C-alpha cells in the first residue's frame, strides 16, 4: 500500500430552487456523481458524467 495522486474535479455550480438543486458539472473525463437522501428513503443516483 502507498499513496496515489488522484484528480479533483471542477467544483460544481449549484443553483437553488424550491425543494431542489441544479448542479452545473464540468468534466473532461468520466467523473462519478453519486447522490442519496438522508431519510428513510435513500434513492441513490450513480452516473458517470463527461462534458458539461
Amino acid at each position: 500500500p502507498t499513496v496515489c495522486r488522484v484528480p479533483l474535479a471542477h467544483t460544481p455550480t449549484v443553483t437553488k430552487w424550491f425543494k431542489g438543486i441544479t448542479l452545473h458539472l464540468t468534466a473532461t473525463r468520466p467523473t462519478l456523481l453519486t447522490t442519496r437522501k438522508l431519510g428513510l428513503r435513500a434513492d441513490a443516483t450513480a452516473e458517470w458524467i463527461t462534458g458539461t
Binding site: 500500500p1 430552487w17 425543494k19 438543486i21 453519486t34 428513510l40 435513500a42 450513480a46
Partner: protein, 439 residues
C-alpha cells in the same frame, strides 16, 4: 434529581431543556449527540478472491496405465488419457507406441496478490447503538459514551445517564455482508460448502493462509490433440471478478439516514433516525437555592423579525428588571422554538437579545428568564433562501405549522357551518313545540 427527556437522534443539534425543582433555581440542560456507532455482531464465514489454476507437470507412465487418485486440493480434477505418444524438444518421450497413458491434474489455489485484493463474507446479527453525549448542566460540561439499550448506565464522573431504547429499530446491513478493500456490499453469498462455479464464493477458505481451501470452478480436462506435451483445460470465469464487475454501488453510497459505513470494526456512524429517551440523575450540588439566583421583577418579550428556517432565523429582546446581578438560564417553553443561548447576564434594568429557530410561521411561544414566563407574538415570514447547508433544528408539527390567519379562516368556515346547523336545530325544536301546542 431525575429528569427524563427525549433527545432527537440527529448528531450535532443541541437539545435544550429546563429542569425546575421546587425551591431550587432552574438549571439549564444541553444534550448533544456528538457521534453515533451502529455496530452489528459479526461472524466471518470465509475469504474469497481470484483463483490460481495450478496445472502440475503431466505424468506419463507411458507404456502401461495410470490410475486417478483422490486429493484434498481445491477442485482437484484428474483424467487419464488412452494413447498419447507425447513429444518435447528432443523427440519421442518413450518407447511403446499406443500404450502410453497421460495423467492430467488441475487444482486451484489463492492468487499471490490475494492478501490485498480479497473479499470477506460476513453474517451480521442485531446491531447495537452507541452514542457520544455532551450533557451541559449548569456551568459544567461532561462528555460520555452510552449504550442505547435502556439498562446500561454509561457515566463519566457522576452524571449517571441511561440511554433509553431507540424508538425505531434500524440496521443498514442485511443478514449477509461482503467487505472488499473497505467497501461494504449487501450480497447474498453462498454458504460455506455451496460453491457455485462462475459466481461469488466459488473458492472458499477460512483464512488466506489456510490449507483447507474448498473450490468449485468447473475445470474440464480436454484430450490432448497436438503431439507436444500439453494439458488442455477449460474453466469458468472467476466469480470474484464477475462480482467485481457486477457489484453495484456500496452501502457507503446506498445507505439510508445518511449513515457513514465504516470498517474495522463494521459500523454505521452518525445515523439520524428515531428518538432516544435519556434519563439523567444530575448531582445535587449543581442545583442552587432559589435564594441565590437573581429574581426577575417583570419582563416582556418583543420579537424583532423572524423566519422559520433551519438556522437561527429569529431575534428576540426582552426588557427585564432584576434586583440583583447574576446569571439566569433562558429557555423556550415550546417544541417548535429553540434558543441559541442557555445562560445570560442580568444587571438591574436591561434588555438582552436571544436568537431562536422556528418551524411554525409564528413566534407564539413562551420564554423564561430564570423563571417569570413571558409570551411572544409575531409573524414568521417564509425564508427567501430555498436550500441551506445545515439540518433543521426543530421538527414540523401541525397546530404550529398552520398559521393564525389560516386558523381564523378555517374556524370561520367550520364555525359558520356549525352555527348554521345549530340555528337549524333550535328552529327545529321551536317549530316542534309550536306544532305540539297547535294540536
Amino acid at each position: 434529581f431525575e429528569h427524563a427527556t427525549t433527545v432527537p437522534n440527529v448528531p450535532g443539534i443541541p437539545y435544550k431543556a429546563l429542569v425546575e425543582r421546587a425551591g431550587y433555581a432552574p438549571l439549564n440542560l444541553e444534550i448533544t449527540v456528538v457521534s453515533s456507532e451502529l455496530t452489528p455482531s459479526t461472524n466471518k464465514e470465509y475469504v474469497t478472491c481470484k483463483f490460481h489454476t495450478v496445472i502440475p507437470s503431466p505424468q506419463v507412465k507411458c507404456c502401461g496405465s495410470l490410475e486417478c487418485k483422490a486429493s484434498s486440493k481445491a477442485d482437484y480434477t484428474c483424467r487419464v488419457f488412452g494413447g498419447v505418444y507425447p513429444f518435447m524438444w528432443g523427440g519421442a518421450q518413450c518407447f511403446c507406441d499406443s500404450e502410453n497413458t497421460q495423467l492430467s491434474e488441475a487444482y486451484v489455489e489463492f492468487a499471490p496478490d490475494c492478501t490485498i485484493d480479497h473479499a470477506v463474507a460476513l453474517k451480521v446479527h442485531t446491531a447495537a447503538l452507541k452514542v457520544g453525549l455532551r450533557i451541559v448542566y449548569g456551568n459544567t460540561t461532561a462528555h460520555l459514551d452510552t449504550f442505547v439499550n435502556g439498562v446500561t448506565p454509561g457515566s463519566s464522573r457522576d452524571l449517571k445517564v441511561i440511554a433509553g431504547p431507540i424508538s425505531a429499530a434500524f440496521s443498514p446491513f442485511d443478514h449477509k455482508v461482503v467487505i472488499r478493500k473497505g467497501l461494504v456490499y449487501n450480497y447474498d453469498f453462498p454458504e460455506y460448502g455451496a460453491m457455485k462455479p462462475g459466481a461469488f464464493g466459488d473458492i472458499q477458505a477460512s483464512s488466506l493462509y489456510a490449507t483447507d481451501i474448498v473450490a468449485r470452478t468447473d475445470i474440464r480436462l480436454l484430450k490432448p490433440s497436438v503431439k507436444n506435451i500439453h494439458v488442455p483445460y477449460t474453466q469458468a470465469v472467476s466469480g470474484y471478478e464477475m462480482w467485481k464487475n457486477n457489484s453495484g454501488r456500496p452501502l457507503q453510497e446506498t445507505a439510508p439516514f445518511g449513515c457513514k459505513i465504516e470498517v474495522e470494526p463494521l459500523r454505521a456512524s452518525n445515523c439520524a433516525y428515531g428518538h432516544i429517551p435519556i434519563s439523567i440523575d444530575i448531582p445535587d450540588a449543581a442545583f442552587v437555592r432559589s435564594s441565590e439566583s437573581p429574581t426577575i421583577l417583570e419582563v416582556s418579550c418583543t420579537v424583532a423579525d423572524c423566519i422559520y428556517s433551519a438556522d437561527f432565523g429569529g431575534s428576540l429582546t426582552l426588557q427585564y428588571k432584576a434586583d440583583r446581578e447574576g446569571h439566569c438560564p433562558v429557555h423556550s417553553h415550546s417544541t417548535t422554538a429553540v434558543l441559541k443561548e442557555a445562560t445570560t447576564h442580568v444587571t438591574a434594568t436591561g434588555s438582552i437579545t436571544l436568537h431562536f429557530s422556528t418551524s411554525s410561521p409564528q413566534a407564539n411561544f413562551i420564554v423564561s428568564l430564570c423563571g417569570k414566563k413571558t409570551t411572544c407574538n409575531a409573524e414568521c415570514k417564509p425564508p427567501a433562501d430555498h436550500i441551506i447547508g445545515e439540518p433543521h433544528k426543530v421538527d414540523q408539527e401541525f397546530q404550529a405549522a398552520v398559521s393564525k390567519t389560516s386558523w381564523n379562516w378555517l374556524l370561520a368556515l367550520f364555525g359558520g357551518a356549525s352555527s348554521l346547523i345549530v340555528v337549524g336545530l333550535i328552529v327545529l325544536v321551536c317549530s316542534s313545540m309550536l306544532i305540539n301546542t297547535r294540536r
